[PDB]
């Protein structure tokens, strides 16, 4: 049906912009392979998994984020039941056929097209009623999927919180921010150091609240596009084709991808350090901790000591006045975490409480996060650069955050590639230049 | 240039009398000293109290002892300070300790005087570069 | 056509081939090279 | 005399650039 | 856009090739294992094998220090059992 | 005539051209290309540079390197039956003998390769302006491999034939060198890094204002072999370029020609750089700088900032790097910021 | 008047214009020029910086003692960090050029403004009928300053510690750089060479090819690029006979014969291979560095056979402790 009389080999899949049915297959199968990637290395890193071990320290990227919605995990994120563990990636790894089956039925054996074995199915690009439409179906089922988590934290169990009062546990949320003063303020937040937007969330509070916001804007927002057109505006400024919609949502997942690699990079809360790894500032403000709690017991006062700069040796004054810890470390006084805060004070880090409210757990968890901070080699080989091999490690932080910032990176090209390409097509010369009438050559010479 | 039994002949107790280990031995002290130690001790050193370090000097003149195979197990399940003077269980990982450690719950006896005859092992092989920091590297 | 065999191609080919698959093979067997 | 020598070239550079953009050769098609 | 040469492409299609280099290719392969394996290549370039870098006691390199006679030094070095 | 025969046989149109070149050529880069290779995967670089060196000991691609021969051999061509192998191959090998091997080949085979070039282009009746760009590699290979050492003591202090063996070679150059200061090498960049940019701004240019030849999308298939119109419009692609960066190519044989000064001129003046610090004749210092920053110990810049990551370079560098000064540098005397 | 503002969107629109000032363009210039203003005031006349927060200013401009060499615009101090630090954000202008004010508002506007002018590079293309992806060669480029600017200050976690404004500035970055990240030895960096010694390569390959076939309509003693005119009709040069030199210096199927294929190879290369250079810097921004083979190789007793990769790290040691002399109170470096 389709061959080289449409597109090259190396452009196959655009051979099918105009192929709903077979279409339809592709985007099946391929969410089946999603599912079964999911499904498979979540066996996978149970099956290497080991209980009485930190999962930073096993390579994982599944498990913990299994954890976080309060599954197998309990007191100090101490693992109970692997159970649920295999749960979900077993069920994950069935559904994957199922999908999987559908994908390569409706790409293989179903209607080429689907316009005319159903028109309720079939669809016209340019039919901005059914594109809005099929928008307005997704922008609902999103929208449930985000109740699902409000559900999951409320009812069925909650979330793992790392601010815990006795400690970090998983802890049943039964109080979501709904103020939307307070929940939409946060997109009002600066992206900088200190006011940190969307990644600055630091309780479960607001994830909830902010949760059972989208899911009933997004539901909302579902039902009006099921309802309606786009205006006049809406359509006198966009492009309307099977391409222009894709780079649409190409530059989308770009800008997501952006931010999700800030947020395991910078949040504590959503990406708890007892899963994954210490963050970065955590760990070179533990390493501040560390010696500041050894000296002090060596007899040193941290509160007069002098550094080489003479700026303070364990503690010193940030920008505002706060005291903060010393060293390089003046970069993190924007760090906040459980073992920490309780040090510090109104005007910051309290010289008393530094001087005898120490608590042993806190001094070896300094020294855990110390030892153990996002530095490592392409061939996992923890520390720095200059190390010699024996501690195989590389934060999952580091994982997650390099390797989402080259997709996302990747997919900004995507976007900019088939953006431009889609304003061509519209306009009709993305095949080259007419060689009768250039336009170029209608122009006046600036010269 | 081999890994003789000559080599892995160390002091087992502060009586002069030794004991020789095995290449199993050896392997598997080197593999738990990565599972449990190398996140601090990687290369004899120490990276949260650079002040004291793995040297079969610096063990000899601790207190107790720990220059030696029942010295070192020791430690391993009721850690001290240089002078012993003062028990550190609760901020150094150990036996008695391995609720707050849970690396050392698996760890049984065998795997303890593993770990000690790699710490005594290591030295006789790297030399100075066991001790030292960067500078050997 | 009626192609040859040997030619001054096939030489050329198999100074580079040769030698190549006889390194993979010496290669492939420090894999298991140990201490 | 240094820092003086220095802008003065610079200045030179970005002279030139001015000239080169909008005192160029027009550029004549065909019959050139 | 042609010369005297057999197409590659009808040769490596050709069950003749096949039937040729199922036996000579992995000859070769099978050839430079037994090199390696069999200690062979350790003589040929003088590589020390993994036992064979220092004496047991010594921890100095065996650094050639004059060109005319290295290859006598060398073979001293060979001496003290390294 | 038999010579006119030879020839004949020689500049046959066959798969792999051949030539008179060819009988320079294929010999010496076979054996270069097949030296490197050997001593890759089996020969190694601990008499030499006391340095595992060969997949046979255990190196990967990065880490494997057919290193130089020792400080102790000089400028020594290491010839297998010289006085030094005495005819004999392992040691030979064990000696470095491969490096002046591979070296000594590998730059005829680049003459060879030069003069097929010249050859080759003479016969199809083209212009030799393909020989004349391959000058700067050939500049770079003479500066760098053979000038350079030449200048050294000895072959031991040039570039070892290997990946990681070529990152040091970098570090030597910053730490001893201070090669990045050095106004020769800026125009290399310069070259090169602007040479990437002419390779890369005018393919976009070509692909992005071709004309419509073909119905297809795929504007591969659409272009004519066989010359005639432009297959681009080289009129809209003067008025683009005019217009966003203010100027603009509007002759194509000047153009290309520019492709081919900026990065061949470019390579040329990183060889001069090279040439200098044979003789140790580098850029490394200025001298009113220094001279205010003895008496002024509050005077700091970017250029105090590296050579002091220069002495750092050198000092820890040094003993391991050369085996044969006997470095021995004591824990005290080692140049040291705080804490680290 | 037709409409005020139909008639101002036109002008900006117009492909007219001696410069086309597009709808980026409306950004691109404003932007641009607040940075170059600024960058050329304080690269001559700006004060010593206290770029490590360590109350250690480093001076880098002409007027305090610098030349173009070694003059540079300081990065922001350290302790800022992250924090936005405009100028009314500070309790005058002293206190903004000693902490490296003038940084930020350089890196931030110029950034800015290269973005839109990749944005401009599609507008321009589009009012003229030609095909768009220009700007996406210039992304490369681009995504790179970023890296520089932007990417790697996020990443540790401060702007004293993105790449300075100057030559010298430069040279530091680097070196730093190779201590704590090893990125000669890592895959993408690797690749950036790659991409940029084959693009010099080929950028020397192609304009000598095509240079040497070229058609003769000039004298012995008339420069041979008269022979050309500007929109001409037909090709200057036989690309039939650059086809049939090339393919026989290396062999007849490993050339191009295809000027499309030809100068699409000609812009894919070095844009691929930059691109991954500038996810090199942008991935060791969060501390993946290269390959770390120290103490790889061992004997059969366990001694440390040393390999080049050794010889590399006693260098990048070197590095590692002696920058930033003062600024270090702790073993580690994590940060
Ligand atoms: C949601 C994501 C998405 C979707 C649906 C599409 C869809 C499409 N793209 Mg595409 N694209 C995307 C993201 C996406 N793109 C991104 C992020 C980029 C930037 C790199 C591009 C860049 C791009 C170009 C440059 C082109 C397309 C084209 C196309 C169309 C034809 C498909 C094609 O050429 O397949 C063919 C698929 C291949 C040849 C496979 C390529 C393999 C990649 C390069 C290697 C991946 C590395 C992998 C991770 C390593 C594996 C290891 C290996 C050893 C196994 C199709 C409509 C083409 C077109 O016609 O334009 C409209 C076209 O020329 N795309
Ligand atoms: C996510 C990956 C993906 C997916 C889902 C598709 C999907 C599709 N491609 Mg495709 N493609 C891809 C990647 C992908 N492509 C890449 C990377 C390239 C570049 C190399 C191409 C190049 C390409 C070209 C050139 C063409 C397509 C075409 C098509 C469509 C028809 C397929 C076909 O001809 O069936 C033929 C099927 C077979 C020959 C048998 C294959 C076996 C099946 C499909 C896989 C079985 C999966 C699994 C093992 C079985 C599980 C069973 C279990 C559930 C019980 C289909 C929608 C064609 C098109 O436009 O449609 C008209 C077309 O001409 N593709
Ligand atoms: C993209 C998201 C992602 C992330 C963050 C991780 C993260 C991780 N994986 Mg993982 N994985 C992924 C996707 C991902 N994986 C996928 C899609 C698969 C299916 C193939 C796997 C299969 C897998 C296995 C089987 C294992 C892991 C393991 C791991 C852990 C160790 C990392 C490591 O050593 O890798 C290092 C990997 C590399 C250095 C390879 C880098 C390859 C790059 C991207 C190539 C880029 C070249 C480019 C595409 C060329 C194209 C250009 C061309 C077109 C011109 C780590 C937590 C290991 C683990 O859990 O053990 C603790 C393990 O055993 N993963
Ligand atoms: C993206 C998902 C998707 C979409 C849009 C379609 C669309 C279509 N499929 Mg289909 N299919 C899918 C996935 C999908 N399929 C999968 C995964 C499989 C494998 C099991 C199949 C197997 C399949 C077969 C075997 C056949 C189709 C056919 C068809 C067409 C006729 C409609 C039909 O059969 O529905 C009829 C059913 C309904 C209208 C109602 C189904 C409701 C189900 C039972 C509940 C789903 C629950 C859902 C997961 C949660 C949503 C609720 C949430 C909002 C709260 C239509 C174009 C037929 C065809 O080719 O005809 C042209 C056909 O014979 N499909
Ligand atoms: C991802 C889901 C999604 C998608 C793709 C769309 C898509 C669309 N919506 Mg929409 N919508 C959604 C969810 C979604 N909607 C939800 C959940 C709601 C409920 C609140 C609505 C409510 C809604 C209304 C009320 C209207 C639309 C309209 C439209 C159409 C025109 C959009 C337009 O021109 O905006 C272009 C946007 C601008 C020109 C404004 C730019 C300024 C932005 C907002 C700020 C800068 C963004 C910045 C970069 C991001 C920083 C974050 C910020 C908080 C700091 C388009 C088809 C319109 C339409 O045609 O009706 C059918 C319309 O009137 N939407
Ligand atoms: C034409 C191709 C060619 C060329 C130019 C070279 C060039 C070289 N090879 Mg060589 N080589 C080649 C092919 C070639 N090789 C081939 C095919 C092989 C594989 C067998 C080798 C294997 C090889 C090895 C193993 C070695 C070299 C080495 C060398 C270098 C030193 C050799 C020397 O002293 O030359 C001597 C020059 C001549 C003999 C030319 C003499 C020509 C005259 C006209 C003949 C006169 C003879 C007559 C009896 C004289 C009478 C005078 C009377 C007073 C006695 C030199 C760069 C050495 C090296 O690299 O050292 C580091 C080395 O060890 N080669
Ligand atoms: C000096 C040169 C030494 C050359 C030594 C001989 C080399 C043999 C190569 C044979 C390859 C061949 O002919 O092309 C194999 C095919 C050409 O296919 C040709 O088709 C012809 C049809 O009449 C005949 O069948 C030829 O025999 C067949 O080779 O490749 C090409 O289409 C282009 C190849 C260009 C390769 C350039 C090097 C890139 C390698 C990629 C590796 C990266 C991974
Ligand atoms: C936004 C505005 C951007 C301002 C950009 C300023 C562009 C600089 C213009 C340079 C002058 C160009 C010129 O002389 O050639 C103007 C000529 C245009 O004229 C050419 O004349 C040739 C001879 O006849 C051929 O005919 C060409 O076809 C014809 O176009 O351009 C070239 O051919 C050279 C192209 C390379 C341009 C140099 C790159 C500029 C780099 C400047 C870096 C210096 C930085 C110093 C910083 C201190
Ligand atoms: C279209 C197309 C395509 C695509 C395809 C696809 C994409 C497919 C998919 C597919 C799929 C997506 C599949 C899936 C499957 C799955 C399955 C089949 C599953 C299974 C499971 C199971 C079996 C389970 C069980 C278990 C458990 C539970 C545990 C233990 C073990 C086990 C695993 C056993 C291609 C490109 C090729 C070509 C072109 C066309
Ligand atoms: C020295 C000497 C000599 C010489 C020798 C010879 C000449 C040899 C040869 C040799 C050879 C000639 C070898 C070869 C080898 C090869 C190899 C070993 C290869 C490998 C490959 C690979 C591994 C690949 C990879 C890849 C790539 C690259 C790309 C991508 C993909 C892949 C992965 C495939 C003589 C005797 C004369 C004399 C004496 C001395
Ligand atoms: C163009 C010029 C190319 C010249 C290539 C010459 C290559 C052959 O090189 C030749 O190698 C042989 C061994 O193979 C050396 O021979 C050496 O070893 C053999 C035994 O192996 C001894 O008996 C002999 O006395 C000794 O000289 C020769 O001294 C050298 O001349
Ligand atoms: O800034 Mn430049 O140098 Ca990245 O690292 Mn940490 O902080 Mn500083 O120390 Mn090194
Ligand atoms: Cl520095
Ligand atoms: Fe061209």
């Given at each position: 049906?389709?061959?080289?009389?449409?597109?090259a080999?190396?452009?196959?899949?655009?051979?099918?912009?105009?192929?709903?049915?077979k279409?339809?297959?592709?985007?099946?199968?391929?969410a089946?392979?999603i599912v079964?990637?999911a499904?498979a290395?979540?066996?996978?890193?149970?099956?290497?998994?080991?209980?009485?071990?930190?999962?930073?320290?096993?390579?994982?990227?599944?498990?913990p984020?299994?954890?976080?919605?309060?599954?197998?995990?309990?007191?100090?994120?101490?693992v109970?039941?692997?159970?649920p563990?295999?749960?979900?990636?077993?069920?994950?790894?069935?559904?994957?056929?199922?999908?999987?089956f559908?994908?390569?039925?409706?790409?293989?054996?179903?209607?080429?097209?689907?316009?005319?074995y159903?028109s309720?199915?079939?669809?016209?690009?340019?039919?901005?009623?059914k594109?809005?439409?099929?928008?307005?179906?997704?922008?609902?089922?999103?929208?449930?999927?985000?109740?699902?988590?409000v559900?999951?934290?409320?009812?069925?169990?909650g979330?793992?919180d790392?601010?815990?009062?006795?400690?970090?546990?998983?802890?049943?949320?039964?109080?979501?921010?709904?103020?939307?003063?307070?929940?939409?303020?946060?997109?009002?937040?600066?992206?900088?150091?200190?006011?940190?937007?969307?990644?600055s969330?630091?309780?479960?509070?607001?994830?909830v609240?902010?949760?059972?916001?989208?899911?009933?804007?997004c539901?909302?927002?579902?039902?009006?596009?099921?309802?309606?057109?786009?205006?006049?505006?809406?359509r006198?400024?966009?492009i309307?084709?099977?391409?222009?919609?894709?780079?649409?949502?190409?530059?989308?997942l770009?800008?997501?991808?952006?931010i999700?690699?800030?947020?395991?990079?910078?949040?504590?809360?959503?990406?708890?350090?007892?899963?994954?790894?210490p963050?970065?500032?955590?760990?070179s403000?533990?390493?501040?901790?560390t010696?500041l709690?050894?000296?002090?017991?060596?007899?040193?006062?941290?509160?007069?000591?002098?550094?080489?700069?003479?700026?303070?040796?364990?503690?010193?004054?940030?920008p505002?006045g706060?005291?903060?810890?010393?060293g390089?470390?003046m970069?993190?006084?924007?760090?906040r975490?459980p073992?920490?805060?309780?040090?510090?004070?109104?005007?910051?880090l309290?010289?008393?409480?530094?001087?005898?409210?120490?608590?042993?757990?806190?001094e070896?968890?300094?020294?855990?996060?110390?030892?153990?901070?996002?530095?490592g080699?392409?061939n996992?080989?923890?520390?720095?650069?200059?190390?010699?091999?024996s501690?195989?490690?590389?934060?999952?932080?580091?994982?997650?955050?390099t390797?989402?910032?080259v997709?996302?990176?990747?997919?900004?090209?995507?976007?900019?590639?088939?953006?431009?390409?889609?304003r061509?097509?519209?306009?009709?010369?993305?095949?080259?230049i007419?060689?009768?009438?250039?336009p170029?050559?209608?122009?006046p010479?600036?010269? | 240039?081999?890994?003789?039994?000559?080599?892995?002949?160390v002091?087992?107790?502060?009586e002069?009398?030794?004991?020789?280990?095995?290449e199993?031995?050896?392997?598997?002290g080197?593999?738990?000293?990565?599972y449990?130690c190398?996140?601090?001790?990687?290369?004899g050193?120490?990276?949260?109290?650079?002040?004291?370090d793995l040297?079969?000097?610096?063990?000899?003149?601790a207190?107790?002892?720990?220059?030696?195979?029942?010295?070192?197990?020791?430690?391993?399940?009721?850690?001290?300070?240089?002078?012993?003077?003062?028990?550190?269980?609760?901020?150094?990982?150990?036996?008695?300790?391995?609720?707050?450690?849970?690396?050392?719950?698996?760890?049984?006896?065998?795997?303890?005087?593993?770990?000690?005859?790699?710490?005594?092992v290591?030295?006789?092989?790297?030399?100075?570069?066991?001790?030292?920091?960067?500078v050997?590297y | 056509?009626s192609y040859?065999?040997?030619?001054?191609?096939?030489?050329?080919?198999?100074?580079?081939?040769?030698?190549?698959?006889?390194?993979?093979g010496?290669?492939?067997?420090?894999?298991?090279?140990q201490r | 005399?240094?820092?003086?020598?220095?802008v003065?070239?610079?200045?030179?550079?970005?002279?030139?650039?001015?000239?080169?953009?909008?005192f160029?050769?027009?550029?004549?098609?065909?019959?050139? | 856009?042609?010369?005297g040469?057999?197409?590659?492409?009808?040769?490596i299609?050709?069950?003749?090739?096949?039937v040729?280099?199922?036996?000579?290719?992995?000859?070769?392969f099978?050839?430079?294992?037994?090199?390696?394996?069999?200690?062979?290549?350790?003589?040929?370039?003088?590589?020390?094998?993994?036992?064979?870098?220092?004496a047991?006691?010594?921890?100095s390199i065996?650094?050639?220090?004059?060109r005319?006679?290295?290859?006598?030094?060398?073979?001293?070095?060979?001496?003290?059992?390294? | 005539?038999?010579?006119?025969?030879?020839d004949?046989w020689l500049?046959?149109?066959?798969?792999?051209?051949?030539?008179?070149?060819?009988?320079?050529?294929?010999?010496?880069?076979?054996?270069?290309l097949?030296?490197?290779l050997?001593?890759?995967?089996?020969?190694?670089?601990?008499y030499?540079?006391?340095?595992?060196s060969?997949?046979?000991?255990?190196?990967?691609?990065?880490?494997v390197?057919?290193?130089?021969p020792?400080?102790?051999?000089?400028?020594?061509?290491?010839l297998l039956?010289?006085?030094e192998?005495?005819?004999?191959?392992?040691?030979?090998?064990?000696?470095?003998?491969?490096?002046?091997?591979?070296?000594?080949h590998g730059?005829?085979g680049?003459?060879?390769?030069?003069?097929?070039?010249?050859?080759?282009?003479?016969?199809?009746?083209?212009?030799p302006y393909?020989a004349?760009?391959?000058?700067?590699?050939?500049?770079?290979?003479?500066?760098?491999?053979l000038?350079?050492?030449?200048?050294q003591?000895?072959?031991?202090?040039?570039?070892?034939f290997?990946?990681?063996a070529?990152?040091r070679?970098?570090?030597?150059?910053?730490?001893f060198?201070?090669?990045?200061?050095n106004?020769?090498?800026?125009?290399?960049?310069?070259?090169?890094?602007?040479?990437?940019?002419?390779?890369?701004?005018?393919?976009?240019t070509?692909?992005?204002?071709?004309?419509?030849?073909?119905?297809?999308?795929?504007?591969?298939?659409?272009?004519?072999?066989?010359?005639?119109?432009?297959?681009?419009?080289?009129?809209?692609?003067?008025?683009?370029?005019?217009?966003?960066?203010?100027?603009?190519?509007?002759?194509?044989?000047?153009?290309?020609f520019?492709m081919?000064?900026?990065?061949?001129?470019?390579?040329?003046?990183?060889?001069?750089?090279?040439?200098?610090?044979?003789?140790?004749?580098?850029?490394?210092?200025?001298?009113?700088?220094?001279?205010?920053?003895?008496?002024?110990?509050?005077?700091?810049?970017?250029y105090?900032?590296?050579?002091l990551?220069?002495?750092?370079?050198?000092?820890?560098?040094?003993?391991?790097?050369?085996?044969?000064?006997?470095?021995?540098?004591?824990?005290?005397?080692?140049?040291?910021?705080?804490?680290? | 008047?037709?409409?005020?503002?139909?008639?101002?969107?036109?002008?900006?629109?117009?492909?007219?214009?001696?410069?086309?000032?597009?709808?980026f363009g409306?950004i691109?210039?404003?932007?641009?020029?607040?940075?170059?203003?600024?960058?050329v005031?304080?690269?001559?006349?700006?004060?010593?910086?206290?770029?490590d927060?360590?109350?250690?200013?480093?001076?880098?401009?002409?007027?305090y003692?610098?030349?173009?060499?070694?003059?540079?615009?300081?990065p922001?101090s350290?302790?800022?960090?992250?924090?936005?630090?405009?100028?009314?954000?500070?309790?005058?202008?002293?206190?903004?050029?000693?902490?490296?004010?003038p940084?930020?508002?350089?890196?931030?506007?110029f950034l800015l403004?290269?973005?839109?002018?990749?944005?401009?590079?599609?507008?321009?293309?589009?009012?003229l009928?030609?095909?768009?992806?220009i700007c996406?060669?210039?992304?490369?480029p681009?995504?790179?300053?970023?890296?520089?600017?932007?990417?790697?200050?996020?990443?540790?976690?401060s702007?004293?510690?993105?790449?300075?404004?100057?030559?010298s500035?430069?040279?530091?970055?680097?070196?730093?750089?190779?201590?704590?990240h090893?990125?000669?030895?890592?895959?993408?960096?690797?690749?950036?060479?790659?991409?940029?010694?084959?693009?010099?390569?080929?950028?020397?390959?192609?304009?000598?090819?095509?240079?040497?076939?070229?058609?003769?309509?000039?004298?012995?003693?008339?420069?041979?690029?008269?022979?050309?005119?500007?929109?001409?009709?037909?090709?200057?040069?036989?690309?039939?006979?650059?086809?049939?030199?090339?393919?026989?210096?290396?062999?007849?199927?490993?050339?191009?014969?295809?000027?499309?294929?030809?100068?699409?190879?000609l812009?894919?290369?070095?844009?691929?291979?930059?691109?991954?250079?500038?996810?090199?810097?942008?991935?060791?921004?969060?501390?993946?560095?290269?390959?770390n083979?120290?103490?790889?190789?061992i004997?059969?007793?366990?001694?440390?056979?040393?390999?080049?990769?050794?010889?590399?790290?006693?260098?990048?040691?070197?590095?590692?402790?002696?920058?930033?002399?003062?600024?270090?109170?702790?073993?580690?470096?994590?940060?």
């Amino acid at each position: 049906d389709q061959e080289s009389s449409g597109f090259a080999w190396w452009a196959g899949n655009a051979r099918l912009i105009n192929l709903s049915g077979k279409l339809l297959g592709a985007h099946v199968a391929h969410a089946g392979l999603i599912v079964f990637w999911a499904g498979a290395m979540t066996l996978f890193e149970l099956a290497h998994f080991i209980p009485e071990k930190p999962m930073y320290e096993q390579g994982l990227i599944l498990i913990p984020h299994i954890a976080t919605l309060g599954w197998g995990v309990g007191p100090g994120g101490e693992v109970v039941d692997t159970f649920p563990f295999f749960v979900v990636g077993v069920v994950h790894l069935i559904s994957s056929a199922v999908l999987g089956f559908g994908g390569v039925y409706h790409a293989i054996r179903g209607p080429e097209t689907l316009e005319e074995y159903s028109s309720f199915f079939g669809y016209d690009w340019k039919d901005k009623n059914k594109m809005t439409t099929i928008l307005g179906f997704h922008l609902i089922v999103l929208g449930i999927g985000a109740l699902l988590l409000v559900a999951k934290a409320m009812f069925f169990g909650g979330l793992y919180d790392t601010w815990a009062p006795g400690g970090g546990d998983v802890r049943v949320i039964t109080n979501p921010t709904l103020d939307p003063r307070v929940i939409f303020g946060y997109l009002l937040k600066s992206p900088f150091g200190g006011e940190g937007w969307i990644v600055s969330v630091n309780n479960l509070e607001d994830v909830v609240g902010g949760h059972i916001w989208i899911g009933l804007i997004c539901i909302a927002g579902g039902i009006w596009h099921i309802l309606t057109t786009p205006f006049g505006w809406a359509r006198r400024a966009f492009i309307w084709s099977g391409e222009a919609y894709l780079s649409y949502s190409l530059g989308a997942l770009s800008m997501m991808g952006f931010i999700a690699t800030c947020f395991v990079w910078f949040n504590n809360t959503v990406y708890p350090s007892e899963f994954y790894g210490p963050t970065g500032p955590e760990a070179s403000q533990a390493q501040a901790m560390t010696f500041l709690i050894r000296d002090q017991k060596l007899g040193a006062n941290v509160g007069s000591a002098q550094g080489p700069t003479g700026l303070g040796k364990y503690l010193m004054r940030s920008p505002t006045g706060e005291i903060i810890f010393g060293g390089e470390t003046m970069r993190f006084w924007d760090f906040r975490g459980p073992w920490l805060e309780p040090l510090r004070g109104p005007n910051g880090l309290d010289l008393n409480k530094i001087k005898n409210d120490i608590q042993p757990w806190q001094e070896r968890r300094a020294a855990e996060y110390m030892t153990h901070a996002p530095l490592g080699s392409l061939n996992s080989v923890g520390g720095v650069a200059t190390e010699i091999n024996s501690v195989n490690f590389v934060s999952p932080r580091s994982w997650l955050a390099t390797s989402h910032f080259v997709l996302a990176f990747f997919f900004l090209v995507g976007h900019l590639w088939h953006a431009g390409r889609a304003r061509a097509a519209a306009a009709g010369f993305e095949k080259g230049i007419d060689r009768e009438s250039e336009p170029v050559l209608s122009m006046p010479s600036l010269d | 240039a081999e890994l003789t039994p000559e080599v892995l002949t160390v002091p087992l107790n502060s009586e002069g009398k030794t004991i020789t280990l095995t290449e199993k031995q050896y392997l598997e002290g080197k593999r738990l000293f990565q599972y449990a130690c190398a996140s601090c001790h990687v290369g004899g050193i120490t990276k949260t109290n650079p002040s004291l370090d793995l040297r079969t000097e610096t063990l000899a003149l601790a207190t107790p002892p720990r220059d030696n195979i029942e010295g070192l197990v020791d430690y391993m399940k009721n850690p001290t300070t240089y002078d012993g003077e003062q028990e550190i269980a609760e901020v150094h990982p150990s036996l008695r300790s391995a609720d707050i450690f849970p690396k050392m719950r698996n760890l049984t006896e065998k795997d303890l005087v593993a770990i000690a005859g790699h710490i005594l092992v290591e030295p006789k092989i790297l030399g100075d570069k066991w001790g030292g920091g960067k500078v050997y590297y | 056509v009626s192609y040859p065999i040997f030619t001054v191609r096939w030489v050329a080919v198999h100074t580079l081939a040769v030698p190549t698959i006889f390194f993979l093979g010496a290669i492939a067997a420090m894999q298991f090279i140990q201490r | 005399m240094e820092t003086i020598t220095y802008v003065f070239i610079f200045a030179c550079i970005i002279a030139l650039f001015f000239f080169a953009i909008f005192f160029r050769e027009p550029p004549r098609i065909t019959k050139k | 856009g042609t010369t005297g040469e057999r197409p590659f492409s009808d040769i490596i299609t050709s069950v003749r090739y096949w039937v040729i280099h199922s036996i000579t290719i992995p000859a070769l392969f099978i050839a430079g294992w037994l090199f390696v394996s069999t200690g062979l290549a350790y003589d040929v370039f003088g590589t020390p094998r993994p036992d064979s870098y220092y004496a047991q006691e010594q921890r100095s390199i065996p650094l050639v220090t004059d060109r005319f006679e290295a290859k006598q030094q060398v073979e001293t070095f060979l001496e003290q059992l390294k | 005539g038999w010579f006119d025969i030879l020839d004949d046989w020689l500049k046959r149109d066959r798969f792999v051209f051949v030539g008179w070149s060819g009988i320079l050529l294929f010999p010496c880069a076979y054996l270069a290309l097949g030296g490197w290779l050997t001593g890759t995967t089996f020969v190694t670089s601990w008499y030499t540079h006391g340095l595992a060196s060969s997949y046979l000991e255990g190196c990967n691609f990065l880490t494997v390197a057919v290193s130089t021969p020792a400080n102790s051999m000089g400028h020594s061509l290491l010839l297998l039956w010289g006085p030094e192998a005495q005819g004999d191959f392992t040691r030979w090998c064990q000696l470095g003998g491969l490096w002046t091997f591979i070296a000594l080949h590998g730059a005829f085979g680049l003459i060879g390769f030069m003069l097929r070039q010249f050859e080759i282009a003479r016969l199809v009746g083209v212009r030799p302006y393909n020989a004349i760009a391959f000058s700067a590699p050939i500049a770079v290979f003479v500066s760098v491999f053979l000038i350079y050492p030449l200048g050294q003591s000895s072959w031991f202090f040039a570039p070892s034939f290997g990946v990681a063996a070529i990152f040091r070679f970098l570090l030597f150059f910053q730490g001893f060198h201070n090669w990045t200061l050095n106004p020769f090498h800026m125009m290399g960049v310069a070259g090169v890094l602007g040479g990437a940019l002419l390779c890369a701004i005018h393919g976009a240019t070509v692909e992005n204002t071709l004309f419509q030849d073909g119905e297809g999308a795929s504007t591969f298939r659409a272009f004519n072999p066989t010359q005639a119109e432009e297959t681009y419009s080289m009129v809209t692609a003067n008025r683009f370029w005019s217009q966003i960066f203010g100027i603009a190519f509007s002759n194509k044989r000047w153009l290309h020609f520019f492709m081919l000064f900026v990065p061949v001129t470019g390579l040329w003046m990183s060889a001069i750089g090279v040439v200098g610090l044979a003789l140790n004749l580098r850029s490394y210092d200025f001298i009113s700088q220094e001279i205010r920053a003895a008496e002024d110990p509050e005077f700091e810049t970017f250029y105090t900032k590296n050579l002091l990551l220069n002495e750092g370079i050198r000092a820890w560098m040094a003993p391991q790097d050369q085996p044969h000064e006997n470095f021995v540098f004591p824990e005290e005397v080692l140049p040291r910021g705080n804490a680290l | 008047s037709a409409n005020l503002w139909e008639r101002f969107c036109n002008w900006v629109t117009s492909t007219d214009n001696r410069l086309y000032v597009g709808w980026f363009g409306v950004i691109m210039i404003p932007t641009l020029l607040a940075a170059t203003i600024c960058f050329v005031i304080a690269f001559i006349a700006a004060p010593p910086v206290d770029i490590d927060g360590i109350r250690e200013p480093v001076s880098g401009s002409l007027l305090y003692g610098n030349n173009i060499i070694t003059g540079a615009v300081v990065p922001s101090s350290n302790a800022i960090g992250l924090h936005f630090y405009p100028i009314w954000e500070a309790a005058s202008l002293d206190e903004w050029l000693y902490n490296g004010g003038p940084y930020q508002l350089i890196i931030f506007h110029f950034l800015l403004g290269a973005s839109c002018y990749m944005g401009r590079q599609w507008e321009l293309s589009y009012r003229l009928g030609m095909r768009p992806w220009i700007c996406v060669a210039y992304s490369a480029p681009l995504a790179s300053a970023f890296a520089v600017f932007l990417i790697y200050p996020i990443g540790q976690g401060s702007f004293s510690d993105g790449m300075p404004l100057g030559i010298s500035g430069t040279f530091n970055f680097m070196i730093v750089f190779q201590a704590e990240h090893n990125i000669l030895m890592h895959p993408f960096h690797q690749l950036g060479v790659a991409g940029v010694f084959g693009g010099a390569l080929f950028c020397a390959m192609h304009g000598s090819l095509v240079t040497s076939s070229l058609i003769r309509e000039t004298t012995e003693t008339e420069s041979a690029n008269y022979g050309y005119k500007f929109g001409q009709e037909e090709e200057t040069y036989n690309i039939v006979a650059a086809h049939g030199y090339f393919g026989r210096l290396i062999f007849q199927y490993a050339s191009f014969n295809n000027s499309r294929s030809l100068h699409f190879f000609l812009a894919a290369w070095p844009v691929v291979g930059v691109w991954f250079t500038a996810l090199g810097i942008s991935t060791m921004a969060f501390n993946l560095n290269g390959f770390n083979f120290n103490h790889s190789v061992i004997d059969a007793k366990g001694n440390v056979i040393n390999t080049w990769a050794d010889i590399i790290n006693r260098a990048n040691l070197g590095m590692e402790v002696m920058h930033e002399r003062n600024a270090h109170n702790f073993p580690l470096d994590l940060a």
